[PDB]
Paper text:
The DNA sliding clamp [name] ([name]) is an essential co-factor for many eukaryotic DNA metabolic enzymes. [name] is loaded around DNA by the ATP-dependent clamp loader replication factor C ([name]), which acts at single-stranded (ss)/double-stranded DNA ([name]) junctions harboring a recessed 3’ end (3’ ss/[name] junctions) and at DNA nicks. [name] is composed of four small AAA+ subunits, [name]-5, and one large AAA+ subunit, [name], which assemble head-to-tail into a two-tiered partially open ring structure. To illuminate the loading mechanism we have investigated the structure of [name]:[name] bound to ATPγS and 3’ ss/[name] junctions or nicked DNA using cryogenic electron microscopy.
In classes 1 and 2, [name] is dilated in a planar fashion compared to crystal structures of closed [name] rings. In class 1, the space between [name] protomers measures 22 Å, which is wide enough to accommodate [name]. In the open state, the AAA+ domains of all five [name] subunits bind to [name]. Unique among the [name] subunits, [name] forms a second interaction with [name] via its C-terminal A’ domain, resulting in each [name] protomer associating with two [name] subunits in the open state. Together, these interactions stabilize [name] in an open horseshoe-like shape that is patterned on the shape of the AAA+ and A’ domains of [name]. Thus, the open state of [name] represents an active, pre-hydrolysis state of [name] with which [name] is fully engaged. In the open state, the 3’ ss/[name] junction binds between the collar, AAA+, and A’ domains of [name], which we call site 2. The 3’ junction binds to a hydrophobic surface at the interface between the collar and A’ domains of [name] formed by Phe666, Trp669, and Leu670, with Phe666 serving as the separation pin for the template strand. Eight base pairs of the double-stranded region of the DNA in site 2 are resolved in the density map, extending from the junction through the gap between the AAA+ and A’ domains of [name] toward the opening in the [name] ring between PCNAA and PCNAC. For a DNA to bind at site 2, it must adopt a highly distorted conformation. Indeed, the fourth and fifth bases of the double-stranded region base stack on the opposing strand and do not adopt canonical Watson-Crick base pairing to enable the DNA to access to the narrow opening.
Residue numbers in the entry:
A (entry chain E): 1 to 353
B (entry chain D): 22 to 353
C (entry chain F): 0 to 256
D (entry chain A): 480 to 786
E (entry chain C): 6 to 335
F (entry chain B): 7 to 321
Write the structure that this text describes.
DNA sequence: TTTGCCCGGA
DNA sequence: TCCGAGCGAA
DNA sequence: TTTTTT
């Protein structure tokens, strides 16, 4: 679409522009795709995993994979409650995010996916006999968000119907993927681009958009502030250009998102005042962040690594902080009410300082 | 042939094709003559041959034509609540066994019972498992149950008591190299000496993973189109193993002990996407088999690695857990 | 096949099955050369149904050796519904069978519909439960018994039957009050079907659960008269006569609190 | 007791049993001012005991004491009182009684404790333990209690852990911070905040599946990364250019299948220095009316008909 | 049933048919048999661990009381049946309050696996049990008393089925050997009894597997080697070798020894942990802290193993736990 | 069959009920002089609640018992519909009784009735009290809503003491010609824990088993209450003795790990001699082990570890 | 000492 | 177009 | 959707 992060997204394996060895591996997979195993792409956020999944699908099935439409599918729970799932589809593949339905994601696996596996499909645009002569492809986004029951429901579908269906699962971490599912997948590591690769991409955008640029070093700064997140770097470039009248300067500052600013303020507060009253104000800040769709795990990660950057703390404080972060990150994984665990972490940190 | 991923293409067809589970396969093969198959509980780690074994046994017992009428297979993809157990499963267990044809009777043992396979039974609720208990006993005359699981403690004690236990062992270079080499020869994959054993070492007990790794390596070699052998470095790259140089860098940063340096190095390291579990495994191997560290250090680090691996098993943030582990090692 | 039994019209068998469907779930049919007998017992083990169909109910019948077919009544009724009341219904079974074949065939066309219902391994004896000399034996039209039962069931969960010399008394006592119907024997040579007959050696007084009687009266569709046999120590026998055989309900009375 | 002394004594005269007025107060305390209950007590006791006085009032009061469940604010007040956690207080108000307090209202008690456990001046602090350290211990226990709570309401339905939950969520943290209240007992804020978060996640899902055909991200990445730039393409041009930015804003909205409702929702999401309410309130009504009029004057592409 | 009883699993082929074939529960059997003899049958509760003979005993009692036609004279319900409040109020209450269809006599209701019933159904049972005692008797069977209400427990006469002692298992094994024409060595019998934990089902299942594992069961003799082979379990010698290496050798040698012993027969780690715990329980330790550390750390390792995890790391954890705990011994 | 002794020797008159002397005396007074109040009888299992209400009703109403008593218990439907129709109609119905007598509604096991159903009873109780009186029996009196407690006389029964149980047992023993020794009856009382039902059941069991009621014959078939064993385990001074009790008296007798852990929780809760904060720490450890067992890891090692942690605490 | 969203219906 | 039921479901 | 009391 119109935003630069979308306008210039590559549409084929030939148009990819970072991590050349991974590109070669993907081309090798797409060379003879009839016995392609199920795939699991993993790597840090915003590096190009979905871009590469779409490029691989294009290499296998042609450009038609980018002609997408959305459709609403209905389901009913045992309690008779109605649920809807948005499904993205091309003529050659489906894309689902079962975690959209929360703990009911299992239903999506047990009914929708299974059905796709058991049926043949018609095709009156590529097949001479009206039937599609190819396996069906299903992309499962945010696969590490599936509950253990849904992941279990995948196991035998992947084996029994391998003739008719192939799965591509995408995740930012494999830690929550159960061992049987990883056993069934070809695991593809997708590393972040280097800062030079990011600078080259950003420079290409700067040229195609006629943005005035005092020095190339600016791009490097952006590349460094994005910590390998290419989506973040492209969006930051656009925002900086918009705020500097499409003319970036060496003095032009890096724009941080609102939630990051709030979290940094919270870090300064925790460091300055360790007391019960301060903890109550912190609870208010945490509720504000959570209510506006900042996930608890993101808050914990950002707060931990903001604290560890504070110059005034000593090694003992920092080691205590990282231990507490580990403990309460596990707590967040095992529990429901996030504010409880975030408050516990902040309280222990205040005690340690 | 050319349409199957190798894991499904080379699934054992009969009991003699299961490679390293003789202690259980022998018992099962004897029932082709004794015809008194007990209720079975297959348990063991992933990709060791449990599902393959039960399928091959049913084929050997009933022949291709009579199998379908003699089997009820229910797995984690199916609804298996207490109502299902009390109605569908019970009703199937109650039925008279399908009549075998004369040809079937000539060519197969045809025991006088049917089989209910509850694959992935460790995902069933305790109450549904309880509902299975008397159904298993009352209809043993015409029905035998086979529960399959990875975590035996998830099966309630009464059901474990009713079942005859078969533990499937981990598959490693010692006991699965023959099968892996057979597959490699069938597919015409050229490898250096050591590569197949290295695959099985990396797989860490899982033959499905080893076969998939072999297929990925052969795809790479065919794409390269140079006729060279697959190397161990290539296999390790495909398997997401951290290069030895990177691991040495980590070890030296830990040796230095500077918190900020470790933090910055870990932040850079995470950008490569290395799986934290593989990193922890490699650190365990490096430290526990190192003559330069003494007994107290190794005791403490063994507990540290255990704690971090346990926390990672719960689905935690890999960056946080890895940094905590490295800081703690550095302060030993 | 070993067993072949053809009903001229499937409606006969459907009505017979519907005559006792609501009381029991699993039924065991024994087919022999002289016809088909069947037994079933309700879930609470308080009611037993015994059916007899003679060879005269069938257009054609053949059973080379005795055979036992256990089945669930809901599945059987579901299948019976899939066929038409007008088609000819042939029950077919083979030696040591795993299923019973229901063959719906209409002579007008060449359309055959064959259903196979898998059988259960129901191993249970029938015991031919029938006491020799019942204390009291009575008979009356089915509609009147149905009416008495339906009226008295609105008052109490239990109904008492008292037989004494030349009098039959139904009684029900409940929360809003009580009801009592007394009938006497009577022969009407103009309309024998309305007759009420009573023979009795020992007077009897027994209590029964109302819901079971409400199920039992559903047999009235199969016969104009119902016979009732009662004894101090035995289950009560409610018999509805068919053109060829019979439908019997053996209902145990309540314990005298 | 004074408002009913005459009545009770008149009853004693009429029914011919000896009531000492001095014990009536205790009777009144026994039944918590329930006049029906005090009359019932006198009726029942006088059947065989024709004198109610100081020699029997104690055991009568014990036998007939009102054991009434408390309501949530009261449960929170009593659970956080420091008296019941001292040696003598614990002897008088037992651990079983505290767990019973949890069971008086087991859907609000954990929430009430978690709401109010920071709002005390504690009297139970151990020697050398500051208020903050006690609060941290309580917070740790509350987190563990949440884990237990998750297990109780799973598919396992492990109601047998309910007593454990009572200890982990309510009794133990309260025992750590019990004392006097430094203000009023407050209703839990978690319920309303959870409702608000649910609303905003619904809105985020809607915006995500409108923009799905154009972006490459999950919904979380939409909130963290995309929306800040959408704000500069959708709102800031209004500030810098009045009604001249209408067409450009409409062009972007069309590119991403966005409605006016999506515009409002998006602007609601921002926090901290990027809050928009006051900025938009300041925009002249002319610009808003022109925006709405131009938008309603044309057709707009749709991503999902009849969601 | 189908074909002969020789087609049945041994756990079902050897199910006791009469009270004289129930072993190792003599006090219970004597008491209940004389209850029947004198006509004094109270409401019974059979409480005990798996495979100790509860269902066998109650069914044998019904067979003795009612003869061969018992199955149509009792109401048997278990966890495979719905037993909600509605079932209690209709099916159970109707059977309790009504005479027998087939033969005159009192009614018997058997609630097997009663720990599977809800609180509401159990409470509904209270006055059904009390009101119809004159003509009906209830028998409740359970593995877990805590899911039974206090009111239900009060109304039943309790009988605890013990884990089967050594002598009873030995006699049952002798019967099985005679019937199967099997031979069993003394050490093999000791190993079998040790691994069964007093559960007869385990004994019979293992014995059937052992017979299947012989080449010629007529001449071949079941030795302890066969038992360990079919069970995939460690030999005691392996356990002692591992423990000695852990307690006396350096880390490299102990790691090597654990890995080599495990690789020898593909032993599981949890089995080694169980065996070593059993061995260490008999140690005399100077310091209670040694026992504390051992127990807590090994329990943590067992729990982590139950969820999967990294096997190598868990083995190293075991080695380190034992070494560190024994450091306290000084 | 012959009646079990528990039912054979159920009291039929109030003077045969032992224990709770003052309350039973009040009930006899009421039965003699009529004017029965609404009443709630509460207490522990098997101490004479149902017996007392039925005896009182029988003595009050004589031959009018059949028409003048409506009994409902947990085996009956008692929803809001029943309260609003059947009970209301029974309260409204005509019935001539002698002066001082009323119709009686017995609601046994009333603690299982829903709050709404209880609310529906308030005005029926108030409006028709000149002809109908209500008797509730329950185990947990706090489950009866306060408005209903307000309209009732509160009768809380206490557990039976060793002397009351001994007296009733001696009556039955003389009636049945049972041979016994003092140690045997003391063992019966010890294992009954104040529940008369259990005392009589175990007396019958011992007599049937071994004829003579002495301590050894009693303990051959009757188990010492495992809560007391668990208490002994929790109070042991050193870890080895506590583990020895766990091993010998609980684990090798066949008690399940879940039973052991839940009993440990219940007993620790009530250990009034251990300071409350220590009990809270112990409860935390017990709950950790309980959660592990519910996951399916209920082994002897887990219970031993629980004991070790409790020992670390109490040190 | 009781929140936020906002049902089904008018 | 207005209103808040009932539930916590982000 | 609800564990225990003395
Ligand atoms: N013992 C084995 N012999 C031969 N092939 C095996 C063996 N075990 C695993 N494999 C191979 O890996 C594939 C998977 O085997 P499975 O029997 O499905 O493993 P599994 O034990 O059922 O794994 P889980 O418990 O579902 S993760 C087979 O199709 C074979 O190709
Ligand atoms: N005391 C025993 N004597 C002889 N065989 C026994 C004995 N206990 C168990 N068995 C054997 O193990 C099998 C199962 O016995 P059951 O009586 O059904 O066990 P159970 O006590 O009911 O186990 P649960 O509580 O249902 S897990 C029997 O068929 C016998 O073969
Ligand atoms: N105080 C008592 N005096 C004599 N016998 C008693 C006494 N209490 C209980 N029993 C005996 O135990 C049996 C049961 O007594 P109940 O009155 O029904 O107990 P309960 O208090 O109603 O028990 P719950 O609350 O329903 S578990 C009686 O039939 C008597 O045989
Ligand atoms: N020029 C160029 N841009 C890329 C490449 N890979 C990713 N991108 C850009 O980076 C954006 C984020 O990539 P995405 O696949 O959504 O990240 P992920 O799925 O979270 O790993 C995309 O929208 C692209 O614009 C590449 O190889 N070359
Ligand atoms: Mg499998
Ligand atoms: Mg059993
Ligand atoms: Mg009672």
């Amino acid at each position: 679409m119109s935003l630069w992060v979308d306008k210039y997204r590559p549409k084929s394996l030939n148009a990819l522009s970072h991590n050349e060895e991974l590109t070669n591996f993907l081309k090798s997979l797409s060379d003879q795709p009839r016995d392609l195993p199920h795939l699991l792409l993993y790597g840090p956020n915003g590096t190009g995993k979905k871009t590469r999944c779409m490029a691989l699908l294009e290499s296998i099935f042609g450009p038609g994979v980018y002609r997408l439409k959305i459709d609403v599918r209905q389901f009913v729970t045992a309690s008779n409650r109605k649920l809807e799932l948005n499904v993205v589809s091309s003529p050659y593949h489906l894309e689902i995010t079962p975690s959209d339905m929360g703990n009911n994601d299992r239903i999506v696996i047990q009914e929708l996916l299974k059905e796709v596996a058991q049926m043949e499909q018609v095709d009156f645009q590529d097949s001479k006999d009206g039937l599609a002569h190819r396996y069906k492809c299903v992309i499962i986004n945010e696969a590490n968000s599936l509950t253990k029951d849904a992941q279990a429901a995948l196991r035998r579908t992947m084996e029994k119907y391998s003739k008719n269906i192939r799965l591509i699962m995408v995740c930012d971490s494999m830690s929550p993927i159960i061992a049987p599912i990883k056993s069934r997948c070809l695991l593809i590591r997708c590393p972040a681009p280097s800062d030079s690769e990011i600078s080259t991409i950003l420079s290409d955008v700067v040229t195609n958009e006629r943005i005035q640029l005092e020095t190339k070093d600016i791009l490097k700064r952006i590349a460094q502030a994005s910590n390998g997140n290419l989506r973040v770097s492209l969006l930051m470039l656009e925002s900086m250009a918009l705020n500097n009248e499409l003319a970036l300067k060496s003095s032009s500052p890096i724009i941080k998102p609102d939630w990051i600013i709030v979290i940094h303020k919270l870090t300064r507060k925790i460091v300055k005042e360790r007391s019960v009253n301060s903890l109550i104000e912190c609870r208010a800040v945490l509720y504000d962040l959570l209510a506006h769709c900042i996930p608890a795990n993101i808050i914990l990660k950002e707060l931990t690594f903001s604290l560890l950057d504070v110059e005034t703390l000593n090694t003992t404080n920092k080691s205590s902080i990282i231990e507490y972060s580990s403990v309460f990150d596990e707590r967040l994984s095992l529990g429901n009410k996030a504010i409880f665990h975030l408050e516990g972490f902040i309280a222990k940190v205040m005690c340690c300082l | 042939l050319a349409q199957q991923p190798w894991v499904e293409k080379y699934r054992p067809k009969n009991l003699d094709e299961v490679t390293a589970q003789d202690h259980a396969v022998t018992v099962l093969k004897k029932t082709l003559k004794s015809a008194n198959l007990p209720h079975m509980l297959f348990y063991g780690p992933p990709g060791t041959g449990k599902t393959s074994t039960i399928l091959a046994l049913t084929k050997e017992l009933y022949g291709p034509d009579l199998m379908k009428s003699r089997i009820l297979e229910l797995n984690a993809s199916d609804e298996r609540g207490i109502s299902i157990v009390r109605e569908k499963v019970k009703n199937f267990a109650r039925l008279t066994v399908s009549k075998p044809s004369k040809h079937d009777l000539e060519n197969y043992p045809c025991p006088p019972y049917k089989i209910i396979i509850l694959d992935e039974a460790d995902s069933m609720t305790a109450d549904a498992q309880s509902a299975l208990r008397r159904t298993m006993e009352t209809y043993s005359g015409v029905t035998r149950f086979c529960l399959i699981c990875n975590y035996v403690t998830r099966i309630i004690d009464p059901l474990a008591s009713r079942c005859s236990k078969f533990r499937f062992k981990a598959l490693d270079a010692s006991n699965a190299i023959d099968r892996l080499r057979f597959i490699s020869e069938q597919e015409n994959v050229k490898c250096d000496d050591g590569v197949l054993e290295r695959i099985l070492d990396i797989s860490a007990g899982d033959l499905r993973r080893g076969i998939t790794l072999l297929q990925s390596a052969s795809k790479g070699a065919q794409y390269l189109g140079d006729g060279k052998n697959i190397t161990s470095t290539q296999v390790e790259e495909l398997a997401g193993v951290v290069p030895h140089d990177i691991l040495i860098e980590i070890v030296e940063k830990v040796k230095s002990g500077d918190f900020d340096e470790i933090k910055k190095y870990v932040n850079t390291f995470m950008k490569s996407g290395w799986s934290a579990a593989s990193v922890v495994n490699q650190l365990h191997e490096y430290y526990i088999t190192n003559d330069n560290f003494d007994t107290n250090f190794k005791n403490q680090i063994s507990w540290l690695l255990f704690t971090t691996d346990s926390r990672l098993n719960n689905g935690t943030n890999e960056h946080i857990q890895l940094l905590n582990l490295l800081v703690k090692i550095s302060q030993l | 096949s070993m067993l072949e039994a053809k009903f001229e019209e499937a409606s006969l068998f459907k009505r017979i099955i519907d005559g006792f469907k609501d009381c029991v779930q699993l039924v065991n049919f024994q087919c022999k050369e002289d016809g088909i007998i069947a037994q079933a017992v309700d879930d609470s083990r308080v009611l037993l149904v015994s059916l007899e169909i003679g060879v005269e109910a069938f257009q054609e019948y053949r059973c080379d050796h005795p055979v036992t077919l256990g089945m669930d009544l809901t599945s059987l009724s579901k299948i019976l519904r899939c066929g038409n009341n007008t088609d000819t219904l042939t029950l077919i079974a083979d030696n040591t069978p795993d299923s019973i074949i229901l063959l719906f065939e209409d002579t007008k066309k060449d359309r055959i519909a064959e259903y196979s219902l898998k059988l259960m391994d129901i191993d249970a004896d029938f015991l031919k439960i029938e006491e020799l000399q019942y204390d009291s034996t009575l008979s009356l039209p089915s509609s009147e018994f149905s009416k008495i039962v339906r009226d008295l069931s609105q008052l109490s969960d239990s109904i008492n039957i008292m037989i004494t010399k030349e009098t039959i008394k139904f009684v029900a006592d409940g929360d809003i009050g009580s009801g009592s119907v007394i009938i006497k024997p009577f022969v009407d040579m103009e309309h024998p079907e309305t007759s009420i007959k009573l023979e009795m050696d020992q007077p009897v007084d027994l209590t029964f659960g109302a819901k079971y009687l409400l199920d039992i009266i559903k047999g009235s569709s199969l016969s104009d008269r119902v016979g009732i046999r009662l004894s101090s120590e035995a289950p009560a026998l409610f018999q509805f006569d068919l053109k060829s055989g019979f439908l019997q309900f053996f209902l145990a009375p309540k314990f005298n609190d | 007791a004074n408002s009913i002394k005459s009545r009770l004594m008149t009853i004693a005269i009429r029914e011919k049993f000896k009531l000492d007025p001095n014990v009536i107060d205790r009777l009144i305390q026994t039944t918590r001012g329930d006049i029906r209950q005090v009359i019932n007590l006198l009726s029942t006791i006088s059947t065989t005991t024709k004198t109610i006085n100081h020699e029997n009032i104690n055991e009568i009061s014990k036998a007939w004491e009102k054991n009434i469940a408390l309501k949530p604010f009261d449960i929170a007040h009593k659970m956080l009182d420091g008296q019941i956690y001292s040696d003598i207080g614990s002897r008088n108000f037992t651990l079983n009684d505290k767990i019973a307090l949890y069971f008086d209202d087991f859907d609000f008690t954990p929430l009430m404790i978690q709401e109010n456990y920071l709002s005390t001046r504690p009297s139970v602090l151990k020697p050398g333990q500051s208020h903050l350290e006690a609060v941290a211990e309580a917070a740790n226990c509350i987190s563990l209690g949440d884990i237990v709570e998750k297990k109780i309401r799973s598919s396992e339905q492990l109601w047998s852990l309910l007593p454990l939950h009572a200890v982990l969520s309510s009794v133990y943290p309260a025992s750590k911070v019990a004392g006097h209240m430094a203000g009023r007992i407050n209703f839990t804020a978690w319920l309303g905040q959870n409702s608000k978060s649910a609303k905003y996640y619904r809105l985020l899902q809607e915006i995500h599946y409108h923009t799905r055909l154009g972006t490459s991200t999950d919904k979380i990445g939409l909130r963290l990364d995309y929306l800040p730039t959408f704000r500069k393409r959708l709102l800031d041009p209004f500030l810098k250019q009045g009604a001249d930015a209408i067409s450009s804003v409409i062009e972007v909205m069309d590119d991403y299948y966005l409605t006016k409702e999506d515009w409002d929702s998006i602007m609601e999401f921002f926090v901290g220095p990027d809050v928009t309410t006051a900025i938009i309130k300041k925009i002249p009504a002319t610009v808003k009316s022109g925006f709405t009029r131009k938008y309603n004057s044309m057709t707009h592409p749709v991503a999902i008909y009849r969601t | 049933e189908k074909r002969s009883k020789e087609n049945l699993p041994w756990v079902e082929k050897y199910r006791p048919e009469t009270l004289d074939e129930v072993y190792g529960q003599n006090e219970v059997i004597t008491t209940v048999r004389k209850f029947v003899d004198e006509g004094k049958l109270p409401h019974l509760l059979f409480y005990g661990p798996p495979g100790t003979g509860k269902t066998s005993t109650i069914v044998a009692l019904a067979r003795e009381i009612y003869g061969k036609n018992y199955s149509n004279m009792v109401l048997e319900l278990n966890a495979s049946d719905d037993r909600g409040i509605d079932v209690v109020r209709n099916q159970i209450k109707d059977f309790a309050s009504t005479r027998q269809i087939f033969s005159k006599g009192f009614k018997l209701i058997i609630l097997d696996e009663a720990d599977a019933m809800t609180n509401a159904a159990q409470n509904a049972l209270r006055r059904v049990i009390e009101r119809y005692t004159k003509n009906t008797r209830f028998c409740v069977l359970a593995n877990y008393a805590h899911k039974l209400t206090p009111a239900l427990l009060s109304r039943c006469t309790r009988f605890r089925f013990q884990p089967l002692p050594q002598e009873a298992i030995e006699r049952r094994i002798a019967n099985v050997l005679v019937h199967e024409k099997l031979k069993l060595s003394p050490n093999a019998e000791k190993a079998l009894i040790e691994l069964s934990n007093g559960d007869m089902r385990r004994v019979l299942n293992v014995l059937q597997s052992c017979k299947a594992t012989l080449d010629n069961p007529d001449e071949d003799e079941i030795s302890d080697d066969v038992i360990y082979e079919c069970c995939g379990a460690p030999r005691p010698s392996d356990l002692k070798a591992v423990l000695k290496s852990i307690l006396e050798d350096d880390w490299g040698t102990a790691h090597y020894t654990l890995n080599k012993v495990r690789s020898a027969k593909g032993l599981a780690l949890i089995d080694l942990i169980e065996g070593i715990v059993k061995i260490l329980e008999d140690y005399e330790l100077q310091n209670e802290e040694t026992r504390v550390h051992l127990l807590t750390k090994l329990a943590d390792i067992e729990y982590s193993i139950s969820k999967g995890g990294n096997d190598q790391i868990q083995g190293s954890a075991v080695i380190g736990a034992i070494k560190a705990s024994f450091e306290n011994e000084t | 069959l012959q009646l079990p002794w528990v039912e054979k020797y159920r009291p039929q008159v109030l003077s045969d009920i032992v224990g709770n002397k003052e309350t039973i005396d009040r009930l006899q007074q009421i039965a003699k002089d009529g004017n029965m109040p609404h009443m709630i009888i509460s207490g522990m299992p098997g101490i004479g609640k149902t017996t007392s209400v039925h005896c009182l009703a029988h003595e009050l109403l004589g031959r009018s018992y059949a028409d003048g008593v409506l009994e409902l218990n947990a085996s009956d439907d008692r929803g809001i519909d029943v309260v609003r129709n059947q009970i209301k109609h029974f309260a409204q119905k005509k019935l001539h009784l002698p002066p001082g007598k009323h119709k009686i509604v017995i609601l046994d096991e009333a603690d299982s009735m829903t709050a709404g159903a209880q609310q529906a009873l308030r005005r029926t109780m108030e409006l028709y009290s000149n002809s109908t009186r209500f008797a509730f029996a329950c185990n947990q009196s706090n489950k009866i809503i306060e408005p209903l407690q307000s309209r009732c006389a509160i009768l809380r029964y206490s557990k039976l003491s060793d002397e009351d149980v001994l007296k009733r047992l001696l009556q039955i023993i003389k009636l049945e010609d049972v041979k016994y020794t003092n140690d045997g009856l003391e063992a019966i009382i010890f294992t009954a824990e104040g529940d008369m039902r259990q005392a009589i059941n175990n007396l019958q069991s011992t007599v049937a088993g071994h004829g003579l009621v002495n301590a050894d014959n009693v303990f051959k078939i009757v188990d010492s209450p495992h809560p007391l064993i668990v208490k002994k385990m929790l109070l042991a001074s050193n870890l080895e003795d506590s583990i020895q009790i766990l091993r010998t008296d609980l684990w090798k007798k066949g008690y399940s790990s879940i039973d052991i852990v839940t009993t440990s929780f219940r007993v620790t809760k009530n250990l009034a001699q251990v300071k409350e904060s220590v009990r809270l720490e112990m409860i935390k450890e017990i709950g950790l082990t309980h959660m592990r067992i519910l996951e399916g890891v209920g082994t002897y090692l887990q219970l031993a570890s629980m004991l070790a942690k409790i020992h670390k605490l109490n040190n």
